[PDB]
Amino acid sequence: IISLWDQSLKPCVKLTPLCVTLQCTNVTNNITDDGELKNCSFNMTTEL
Amino acid sequence: QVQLQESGPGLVKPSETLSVTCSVSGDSMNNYYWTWIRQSPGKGLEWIGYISDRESATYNPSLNSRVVISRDTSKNQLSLKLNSVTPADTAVYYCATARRGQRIYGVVSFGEFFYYYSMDVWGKGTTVTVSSAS
Amino acid sequence: VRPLSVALGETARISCGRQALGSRAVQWYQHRPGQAPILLIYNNQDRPSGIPERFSGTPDINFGTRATLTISGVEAGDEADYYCHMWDSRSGFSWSFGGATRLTVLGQP
Ligand SMILES: *[C@@H]1O[C@H](CO)[C@@H](O[C@@H]2O[C@H](CO)[C@@H](O[C@@H]3O[C@H](CO[C@@H]4O[C@H](CO)[C@@H](O)[C@H](O)[C@@H]4O)[C@@H](O)[C@H](O[C@H]4O[C@H](CO)[C@@H](O)[C@H](O)[C@@H]4O[C@@H]4O[C@H](CO)[C@@H](O)[C@H](O)[C@@H]4O)[C@@H]3O)[C@H](O)[C@H]2NC(C)=O)[C@H](O)[C@H]1NC(C)=O
Ligand SMILES: *[C@@H]1O[C@H](CO)[C@@H](O[C@@H]2O[C@H](CO)[C@@H](O)[C@H](O)[C@H]2NC(C)=O)[C@H](O)[C@H]1NC(C)=O
Ligand SMILES: *[C@@H]1O[C@H](CO)[C@@H](O)[C@H](O)[C@H]1NC(C)=O
Questions:
Q1: Contacts 24+ apart (CB under 8 A), C94-97
Q2: What are phi and psi of B87, to 5 degrees?
Q3: Quick one: how far is CA C88 from the chain centroid?
């Protein structure tokens, strides 16, 4: 199962560019209406 | 007939207190709960806040908490006051009731709801102008 | 205010400005000019007693249709101001009563 998971996970998308400073803010107005939901705005390199 | 009789001075100067009453009659007072409403000509309506059984006063953040809202049982009156009245307050003050409706949309066990404060019975309103005159 | 014009004896649809994000709880009010207002439909479906069937509420399908006030057959007593008061799950405590929606009926006998 370990090897099968690694094999099926190998060809998918690498997420090394997600390591980036996340300007992130709370979403919830009322107290404890839902943390547990973080709206993070960040940078990400496009096609070019 | 809960005729929310409102009676204020009718003529005030800036930076003093306005004393408008709100009578309860034709029905008990402790059974249900009452509140206050206001609106201005040219503008929309502006609730003042709410007084509940615990008598802790919920205030309006957009009015900078410069009012004195309360309630007294002796003469069956709702006691709303405005300290430091600005000249912009030349308008009419209303009365209203408040039924504490419980809006459910999730699970009660996790506090996944909220309370909506619905109002049914209102008053008539008295218009008071505030300026250098009294 | 937004002046609106409609005919007589026609079903009327009244929608307020800001959108209904999240599950919403609409209340309607009858601010007749000069004297005290009164509510039309609260809880999005529950019309209070003393309100004729000409005023109908809008059921919730959890999305789609906005806060609509169904009014079938306006009469000589409906020249007033209609207010959209709504409680959603993103505005938290919906402190504000929102904007003012106006209607001025033409062809009134
Ligand atoms: C797991 O554990 C949970 C613990 O709570 C179990 O319950 C869940 O929470 C509640 C309570 O059981 C239920 O969901 C809510 O139910 C209310 C209606 O409650 C009524 O209660 C009566 C008994 O007191 C009962 O006889 C009735 O039959 C009914 O259950 C419902 O109002 C809630 O939804 C509101 O908000 C939704 C949007 O968020 C709207 O889509 C709903 O329509 C509704 O709003 C109103 O809708 C009216 C029109 O229908 C409209 O007129 C009005 O203005 C409002 O807009 C909510 O559905 C459920 O039972 C359960 N919820 C869930 C998601 O499971 C739970 O059963 C248990 N097991 C499982 C399998 O989850
Ligand atoms: C993406 O990178 C840019 C790089 O400049 C960030 O831009 C700066 O953002 C700060 C606030 O976080 C501003 O005070 C600066 O003035 C911005 N500089 C310029 C030149 O615009 C940007 O903020 C980053 N993305 C996010 C979501 O923070
Ligand atoms: C905002 O985010 C911080 C993150 O630590 C959290 O502690 C806080 O409860 C959130 N909400 C508010 C209202 O500050």
A1: C95/B60, C95/B61, C95/B62, C97/B44, C97/B45, C97/B47
A2: -60, -15
A3: 16
For residue C84, give the nearest of C26, C30, C12 by alpha carbon: C26
Question: DSSP 3-state helix, strand, coil percentages of chain B (rounded to 5)?
Answer: 5, 40, 55
Nearest CA-CA distance, residue B38 and chain C, Å: 11
CA B93 to centroid of chain Cα atoms: 8
Chain B residues at the A interface, defined by Cβ less than 8 Å, are 111-112, 114
Per the entry, the structure determination technique was cryo-EM
Among B44, B116, B119, the residue with its CB nearest the CB of C87 is B116
